[PDB]
Design a protein around this ligand. Structure first.
Ligand SMILES: Nc1nc2c(ncn2[C@@H]2O[C@H](COP(=O)(O)OP(=O)(O)OP(=O)(O)O)[C@@H](O)[C@H]2O)c(=O)[nH]1
Ligand SMILES: Nc1nc2c(ncn2[C@@H]2O[C@H](COP(=O)(O)OP(=O)(O)OP(=O)(O)O)[C@@H](O)[C@H]2O)c(=O)[nH]1
Ligand SMILES: Nc1nc2c(ncn2[C@@H]2O[C@H](COP(=O)(O)OP(=O)(O)O)[C@@H](O)[C@H]2O)c(=O)[nH]1
Ligand SMILES: Nc1nc2c(ncn2[C@@H]2O[C@H](COP(=O)(O)OP(=O)(O)O)[C@@H](O)[C@H]2O)c(=O)[nH]1
Ligand SMILES: [Mg+2]
Ligand SMILES: [Mg+2]
Lengths: 440, 48, 426, 50, 50, 440, 426
């Protein structure tokens, strides 16, 4: 049983999850209540819901998720919304006070008083599984929870489930747009602690998806639940082989081996492909070639960073639908001939393919159309450095004035951590430089 | 309040030209088929 | 759950607090009797933060009614929403404040802080998890500056981890309705530097001008003047009460704002003010909302942001909006206007989004902002104090009450220290 | 079952091509004796450039 | 369009009372979050030879 | 799309707005409240309003106008009239004390006190509008705010905006009647600062509108309400191509490029041909072949000259309703053959045409019968110099002995502008006679 | 294969170009939703020429629609066949061009170039073997003449081996629909001759005289003479997409007709023209049909064929017809009017026959010409240019936004260069 327990921490994680879980309750016909509309399909398959929805006595297809937050305000919706009878009572856990955009509370105060309960529920969920391919995580490298409680977990989990794909998916600080002035700190802090506790981090930024939802899906003014739909289509196309079948099938253990090059540079930027409103699509050709080319464009990329300022070190093209192996091969050959896209020298190859046979699922009420072919290229580009450096510049721009620290030391975090992390991130940046230098 | 000035029937989208570029000899063949006499039928199988 | 406690002292804080629960009882759906009459289940779920419960569906407000003369008590109970207030929360002395800091804080103040703390301790133990207290007063008065400042000191020592709000009506520059305003306000801010976590300085004619040029009525009343003040303190605890897609509470609204322990004195502001002739003529949208939000003619304390520059700002939002324009019209105030922000803080705005607008509107926003422009609210109140304390103007009314003359020297000794830390980033 | 949505479609092709051919005979055979019957009452069809 | 008036023909002029019950008149008909309205959308809703 | 705002300054300018905006309200189903007529209110159905109207979201259509005038008495009867609910209450601004038929008061003394209010108001119209195609400045030439204010008003509009078109449909001092004695002073001065800034005008008088009302229409004793209505009929026809799609669209940008031969000659006509009573059009069959002849006929047009010697040199014809391009073409090819309507031989093109698909509308309470077709003609001619140097000759009689000057120089005005008007004025009449007969 | 991409510039190209798309979605069988509903499989035989297959059986027509306003596209996107197109090809500006070159070719022209040439490009190598480019515009107005002529310069640089077809609308001789045309005509033709291979010099007035004389329609609008151009326009390329016993693509028509690269000046025609009341009064056979193919009243350029000796002639036919009646009849035409042809060419005429007539027809044909009288089109424009250029009549709007005076003189020198190169070949 290729099972996968999903952990959604932080206001984002939960919102993102609600959306992601709507796709899952649709891929497999699981009525937003628990019961599967009596039918046999490619989703009703005992071996197609097990990957996520656990079976019961009276088809109560429970989710194998664990939504966590510290401020009841958000998960009370998942508890008084359409999907209230699904998420098992205590599979969605909440606290009483938030973390107030601060890693300290998330790691040395408000967090501690909860990790115990959460870990216990993951132990229970794991026990029910028979092959926990991985523990998909979804946080927010900016808020106190997705930076603090998320860190605490990744650490404690390491010494409990050990070598077990802990794939990540966070909203790394955006380039210009930002919701907080205490993110520069939290971000440079979490990475330092999670770096050696995470396997892969399919990162994604809000600004990027925004433009993507204005240049393509012309949804001018977009809400979060709009960007959270495509931040959830990536999770399906990433975890589709463990459910629906196909020719070449990729697993939640293949990415780490085919993408992460060295045990530190584990941050593969992500990009989907057929992002066209159900009004500008029909009138166009969405063939393997176009969709593949679309992904390697210096814009469709879902992270505000241009690959043309960096080198690729591993690309995982995960297709889905009526895709023909032959076309893929020819399309990948073209993206190799192009010299505007450059691959590093220590990666002669650098293409990991995967072709599930299930076409993209259409969410009832969304900008995306009803396509037949789709790709989701994860890429470990050395253009994530330009980003890490700007976050670093911000951390130093304020640490000099020891600003916004009064409420970081007086919550537990000794002033030392600031430097520990700062210096470590400086190593990551210098690390990326050498990794790029073409072999001599 | 009445229609004042000459009404000139016009058709801005332009179906008037499509009717007159339709060659009203097969308009009758769309709405049927001609029945001519036999001795224009039998004559013309000989000298045309 | 997420209970916060509201306090108020003096007739200034009482007319603020009475109007502040005109609008929340309107918001949650509480009638002038006490029963629920709303139309949605959303405004009954997190009502625990302000309204308690009593048998019969009687949601009781959560306050301690503090004053020194009972005339304001008759003003509160005879008001339109004065029936719902719990009667033994009306704690009142029988001798007036004297319009004086001294007897309001030392002699007549100390005789009633035990009777206020007892009902504060009584109320605060019936909740499950408490975030903090919230107090509205006037620095120019006798009760709010005298007793209300002592209550700030007492509840901070008893509950150190809890957050504190004060909504202080700072004295006005041009018009003055109290001669001893430079005396009564320079000693209350002496305790506001350490005993408070969030301060929202509010000028009075900064309400008069906005109510004249924007709400556009030539004759304002105190209630319309208190209406704007009640809007933002309801707007600050928006996501604390109601759901949304980006939720921030009072503490999360503190951490992202102040970089230093003492620089915590703020500028409030409410964005969607039109007047009611032009409610149907103007299309209300976010770019028009955030333009009037950062425009300093719509500033709720009489300071000019042109003279200094903002340290950080926040803007929590209401209604059913998008996220692209609470970013594109929010980077634009930073990038296109870059000389009016400090350069040592890279980003400068907290954005929080709710789903529920206030009763009456579709889409609203409130503005709070730390600035260097608060320096000259304290420069002039220094100049009002330094020119007046030097020739021993009214000290015989203060040194004859039970505090020495030397306690006045410390008042500007750390007010000027507030300035030196304000002026250093200018 | 996925073969069966493809099975019935090709079976519709067989019926389609066998009724077009049979209807082709009927239409030409009717038209000739339509001409023959009219030729007895001193009328005929117009063929273009007949 | 004043709810209460201070210059009206009444006798007692309460200055503590406001003249306007609301800041505006246009409250959204229904009060629904985006995480509800949106996620609550799942509800919403040949051959010749077979 | 394709929007253009209007500005009504002066009593003549604002009272045309008190009669023109009736016409637009009857065009697009806008009731005096400002809404769709309660019933017949579909969810959304056009963009035709957008040239002179804008949504508030709810359904009220605020007009795109600026009402400014130093006399509030002419502003109060639209503030307390039928259209109190249409205009935004703040765009409609007044002054305290009128400019009192002095150019000094409209540009130096009290004009300065209201420049900040209009330009702050006009720029928010420009910010609200997405693509602006022109300015509709409605201003007379006689008064102190009809003439003095619009000289300073469009001077600031020509430096803050630049390449936007300017339009005028208002009242020029009549050659034989007048309602003020200082009209040869105000009109001689407002032309000085409106040469390189203005690109349209109305050279003919208002007693020609008396002549059309009395002798074309079957009305006796016509009134300024009837005059203002007939001018408003022409503004709707020049802007009929910006709301209603026709056979060939003629929007606002090439009214500029076609009707000005030289940059100091920017004076087109305004001739609405079918000014026909209900009592005559029951009696008469109106054809498009004759409506252009009637428009060129000295009878129906308001060209204040003898059109025997009217030397047209840049023509523009705009049609509304039941028209076909050939009977436009057959009538307009007949008119070049036809001799005594003398044209320019060195401009063989001469004309341009515009055809719209909307029939001409009628307002209740008027004498015009709703015609199936109408034509509006704006031709730049050189016959204006007869009516142009005569107004200069009207100025020369008071020029010598300095009558009425002490009200100018006594209240903020230099005497040099009385001279500097004259040579620029003589240079303009020099320009009109220079293009006469050099090619024979 | 042999596909061509369509381009529509300006408003005039946006109806005569659009009206082609109802004509050819009539002829190929494509319904206005976009799918296929026809009768014959020879209709979907060479659909690759004008359309590209999108998804699931619909044929979106490939065309780049360029204009400076969206309102002319409001009659095209919301036409009967507006939702067969793709919305990405609807590229447009924001403000007006207004018949000016320096506004439509220099200032506002150059801004929209990057957004038009990318969608021209990215649609060009989506296919395998490009045959040519197919413009549709006018010469009277600079909104389309300005953009269409520039689009020639930037396409011919990177596509030198492709065939250029432009459907220019030359000004009518007697009366104009725009006063500034003779500037717009010479500034078009100055590099239209040197950068294009096929231009069709159709004016509106000859199309009118067709509709009055050989059609007997008293009030046909702009939707009627458009169908006369559009249905003729399909027969020019009828051998690309419909099989025939002697095929002729656009290009072997190009190699055959023009001898010298200064002559890209063609005149079309259509063979079944007569009234509804004059249908049975006429014989539809090619001895009775090629007469009106060569008649003066079925010429779309208003140029006198008696004044004009035809240089090269292409006659492309439709339907099952004999080939000796194509060839013997064409010399039978040449015998009676041998003086009004040229005699240095042994065969002035090129023939081509297709096997598929249009709907409602049993046999049809269409004409492509090249005559001596197309000179008088160009001298008249020069006569209307020099009289307007002598006093620099409308020059100050060209000089106003970035155009040099000398480019007018270079165009006029090239304008009479075409007249002098053309009279010597006579
Ligand atoms: N991409 C994306 N990010 C979100 C979304 N919702 C919240 N976030 C992130 O959440 C961060 C702000 O913190 P919160 O929303 O309060 O979430 P949190 O991690 O629980 O932070 P605390 O409440 O302080 O503990 C921002 O940086 C956002 O990036 C979402 O819907 N999409
Ligand atoms: N057609 C028309 N013309 C008008 C109307 N009202 C005024 N006029 C013309 O406007 C002129 C008035 O003189 P102005 O110089 O414009 O007066 P003003 O603009 O109010 O300037 P001040 O009086 O100084 O404030 C008269 O000569 C009339 O010919 C009107 O209602 N309709
Ligand atoms: N904002 C506001 N201020 C008020 C109101 N009523 C009184 N004040 C202020 O209170 C100040 C006087 O304070 P005082 O009555 O002595 O306060 P107390 O001694 O605490 O009761 C004056 O300067 C007023 O500006 C009100 O309704 N709203
Ligand atoms: N053949 C034809 N020409 C048209 C049609 N509509 C407009 N025109 C031409 O358009 C010309 C006017 O120039 P204009 O439309 O402004 O061109 P633009 O500026 O490029 O858009 C006239 O000369 C007409 O001949 C039509 O339906 N058919
Ligand atoms: Mg949180
Ligand atoms: Mg006046």
């Amino acid at each position: 049983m290729r099972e996968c327990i999903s952990v959604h921490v932080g206001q984002a994680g939960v919102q993102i999850g609600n959306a992601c879980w709507e796709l899952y309750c649709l891929e497999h016909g699981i009525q937003p209540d628990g019961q599967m509309p009596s039918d046999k399909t490619i989703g009703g398959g005992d071996d197609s819901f097990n990957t996520f929805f656990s079976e019961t006595g009276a088809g109560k297809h429970v989710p194998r998720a664990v939504f966590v937050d510290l401020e009841p305000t958000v998960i009370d919706e998942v508890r008084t919304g359409t999907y209230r009878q699904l998420f098992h009572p205590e599979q969605l856990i909440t606290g009483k006070e938030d973390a107030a955009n601060n890693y300290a509370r998330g790691h040395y105060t408000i967090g501690k008083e909860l990790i115990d309960l959460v870990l216990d529920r993951i132990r229970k969920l794991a026990d029910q599984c028979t092959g926990l391919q991985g523990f998909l995580i979804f946080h927010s490298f900016g808020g106190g929870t997705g930076s603090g409680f998320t860190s605490l977990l990744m650490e404690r989990l390491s010494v409990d489930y050990g070598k077990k794909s802990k794939l990540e998916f966070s909203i790394y600080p955006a380039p210009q747009v930002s919701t907080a002035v205490v993110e520069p700190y939290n971000s440079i802090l979490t990475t330092h602690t999670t770096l050696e506790h995470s396997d892969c981090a399919f990162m994604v930024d809000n600004e990027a998806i925004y433009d993507i939802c204005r240049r393509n899906l012309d949804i001018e003014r977009p809400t979060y639940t709009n960007l959270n739909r495509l931040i959830g289509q990536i999770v399906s196309s990433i975890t589709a082989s463990l459910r629906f079948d196909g020719a070449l099938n990729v697993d939640l253990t293949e990415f780490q081996t085919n993408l992460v090059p060295y045990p530190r540079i584990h941050f593969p930027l992500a990009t989907y492909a057929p992002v066209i409103s159900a009004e500008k699509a029909y009138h166009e050709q969405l063939s393997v070639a176009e969709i593949t080319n679309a992904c390697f464009e210096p814009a469709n990329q879902m992270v505000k960073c241009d690959p043309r300022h960096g080198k690729y070190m591993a690309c995982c093209l995960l297709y889905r639908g009526d895709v023909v192996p032959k076309d893929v091969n020819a399309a990948i050959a073209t993206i190799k001939t192009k010299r505007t896209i450059q691959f590093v020298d220590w990666c002669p190859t650098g293409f990991k393919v995967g072709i599930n046979y299930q076409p993209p699922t259409v969410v009832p009420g969304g900008d995306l159309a009803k396509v037949q072919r789709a790709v989701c290229m994860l890429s470990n580009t050395t253009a994530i450095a330009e980003a890490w450096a700007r976050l670093d510049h911000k951390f130093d721009l304020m640490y000099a004035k020891r600003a916004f620290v009064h409420w970081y030391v007086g919550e537990g975090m000794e002033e030392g951590e600031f430097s520990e992390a700062r210096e470590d991130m400086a190593a990551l940046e210098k690390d990326y430089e050498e990794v790029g230098m073409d072999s001599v | 309040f009445n229609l004042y000035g000459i009404p000139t029937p016009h058709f801005n989208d332009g179906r008037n030209m499509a009717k007159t570029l339709h060659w009203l000899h097969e308009l009758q063949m769309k709405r049927g088929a001609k029945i001519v006499s036999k001795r224009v039928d039998d004559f013309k199988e000989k000298f045309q | 759950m997420r209970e916060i406690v509201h306090l108020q002292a003096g007739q200034c804080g009482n007319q603020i607090g009475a109007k502040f629960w005109e609008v929340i009882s309107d918001e949650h759906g509480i009638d002038p009797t006490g029963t629920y009459h709303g139309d949605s289940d959303l405004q009954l779920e997190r009502i625990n933060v302000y309204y308690n419960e009593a048998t019969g569906g009687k949601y009781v407000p959560r306050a301690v009614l503090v004053d020194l003369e009972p005339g304001t008590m008759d003003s509160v109970r005879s008001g339109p929403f004065g029936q719902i207030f719990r009667p033994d929360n009306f704690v009142f002395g029988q001798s007036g404040a004297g319009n004086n800091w001294a007897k309001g804080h030392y002699t007549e103040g100390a005789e009633l802080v035990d009777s206020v703390l007892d009902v504060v301790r009584k109320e605060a133990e019936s909740c499950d998890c408490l975030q903090g207290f919230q107090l509205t007063h006037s620095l120019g008065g006798g009760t709010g500056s005298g007793m209300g400042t002592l209550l700030i000191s007492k509840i901070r020592e008893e509950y150190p981890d809890r957050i504190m709000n004060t909504f202080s009506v700072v004295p006005s520059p041009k018009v003055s309705d109290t001669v001893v305003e430079p005396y009564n306000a320079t000693l209350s801010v002496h305790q506001l530097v350490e005993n408070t976590d969030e301060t929202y300085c509010i000028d009075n004619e900064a309400l008069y001008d906005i109510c004249f040029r924007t709400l556009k009525l030539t004759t304002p009343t105190y209630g319309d003047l208190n209406h704007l003040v009640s809007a933002t303190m309801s707007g600050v605890t928006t996501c604390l009460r109601f759901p949304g897609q980006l939720n921030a509470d009072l503490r999360k609204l503190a951490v992202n704002m102040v970089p230093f322990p003492r620089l915590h004195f703020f500028m409030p502001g409410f964005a969607p003010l039109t007047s009611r002739g032009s409610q149907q003529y103007r299309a209300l949208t976010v770019p028009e909302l955030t333009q009037q939000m950062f425009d300093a003619k719509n500033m709720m304390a009489a300071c000019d942001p042109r003279h200094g520059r903002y340290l950080t700002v926040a803007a929590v939002f209401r209604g059913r909006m998008s996220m692209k324009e609470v970013d594109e019209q929010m980077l634009n105030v930073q990038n296109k206007n870059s000389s009016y922000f400090v350069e040592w803080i890279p980003n400068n705005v907290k954005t929080a989004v709710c789903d529920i607008p206030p009763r009456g509107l579709k889409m609203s926003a409130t503005f709070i902002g730390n600035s260097t422009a608060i320096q000259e609210l304290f420069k002039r109140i220094s100049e009002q104090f330094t020119a007046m304390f030097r020739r021993k103007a009214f000290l015989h009314w203060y040194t004859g009450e039970g505090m020495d003359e030397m306690e006045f020297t410390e008042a500007e000794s750390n007010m000027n220290d507030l300035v030196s830390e304000y002026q250093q980033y200018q | 079952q996925d073969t069966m949505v493809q099975e019935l479609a090709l079976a519709n092709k067989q019926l389609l091509m066998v009724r077009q051919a049979a209807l082709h005979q009927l239409f030409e055979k009717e038209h000739q004796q339509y001409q023959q019957e009219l030729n007895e009452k001193g009328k005929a069809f117009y063929m273009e450039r007949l | 369009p004043k709810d209460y008036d201070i210059e009206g023909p009444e006798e007692v002029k309460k200055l503590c009372n406001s003249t306007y019950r609301r800041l505006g008149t246009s409250e959204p008909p229904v009060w629904i979050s985006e995480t509800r309205e949106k996620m609550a959308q799942v509800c919403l809703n040949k051959a010749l030879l077979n």
